[PDB]
Paper text:
The Vtc4p β-tunnel domain is not unique to eukaryotic polyP polymerases but is a structural hallmark of triphosphate tunnel metalloenzymes (TTMs), whose characteristic features are the presence of a topologically closed hydrophilic β-barrel, the preference for triphosphate-containing substrates, and for a divalent metal co-factor (PFAM families CYTH and VTC). Members of the ancient triphosphate tunnel metalloenzyme family can be found in all kingdoms of life. Our comparative analysis defines that most of these enzymes share a common catalytic mechanism in their tunnel centers, yet they have evolved different substrate recognition modes on their tunnel entries. The observed substrate plasticity apparently allows TTM proteins to act on a wide array of enzyme substrates and to perform very different reactions, many of which likely remain to be discovered.
Numbering used by the authors: -1 to 69, 73 to 133, 139 to 214
Write the structure that this text describes.
């Protein structure tokens, strides 16, 4: 037999500005693709998934994905699950349907009292940047509800490499975006804050 795993993705969000694309161009980045896609997130009425740092979505053209917290000191760690059967097992453990019998994620939604909590369309430009060695990716996202966020992404092999990669992408992010102390918010968090502010408040309360 054999075991297989992926690389580690390291990421940092930033607020783009009017000059972000021009900076990318002058740095020698190339625009690899432009794409538009719907994201739809799901949770229970009590926000069971989100309150425990679990994030379940169906992404147009990609299928189901679930993000779970992992056990970078100042920065978050996530395990991404895209196997439907592993998503469903994780959801059963957390939301406890002992009786529930497995199936595709879609089929188990009702049984788990999972409902759509947010849906929106993102228009994305994805750029690649080689410096002096593997190309960084820069995703520039525009959400149809009216919010723009960029993100710099690097891949690395071992967890030992994560701290240096983080510093690099933080520094690159700062040259591409508006000055800021903290990381720019995720599209979903801005959506929740503006359009589901009672839910946002629950999330705020939990984290402090
Ligand atoms: C302040 C804050 N930021 C981030 C998180 C974690 N989080 C919020 S929404 C989300 C899912 C959306 O992730 P995103 O990075 O926007 O996915 P993308 O659309 O870029 O693929 C996660 C993991 C949190 N709990 N609190
Ligand atoms: Mg990306
Ligand atoms: Mg990303």
């Amino acid at each position: 037999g054999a075991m297989t795993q992926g690389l580690i993705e390291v990421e940092r969000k930033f607020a783009p500005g009017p000059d972000t694309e021009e900076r990318l161009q002058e740095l020698g980045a190339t625009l690899e693709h432009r794409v538009t896609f719907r994201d739809t997130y799901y949770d229970t009425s009590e926000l069971s998934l989100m309150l425990s740092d679990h994030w379940l979505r169906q992404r147009e053209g990609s299928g189901w994905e679930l993000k779970c917290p992992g056990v970078s000191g100042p920065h978050n760690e996530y395990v991404e699950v895209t196997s439907e059967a592993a998503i469903v097992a994780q959801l059963f453990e957390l939301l406890g349907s002992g009786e529930q019998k497995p199936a595709g994620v879609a089929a188990v939604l009702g049984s788990l009292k999972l409902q759509e909590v947010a849906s929106f369309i993102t228009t994305r430009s994805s750029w690649k940047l080689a410096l002096s060695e593997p190309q960084l990716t820069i995703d520039l996202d525009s959400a149809d509800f009216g919010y723009a966020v960029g993100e710099v992404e690097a891949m690395v092999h071992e967890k030992a490499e994560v701290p240096a990669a983080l510093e690099k992408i933080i520094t690159v992010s700062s040259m591409l975006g508006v000055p800021a102390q903290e990381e720019a918010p995720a599209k979903l968090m801005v959506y929740l804050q503006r359009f589901r502010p009672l839910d946002y408040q629950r999330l705020l309360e939990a984290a402090s």
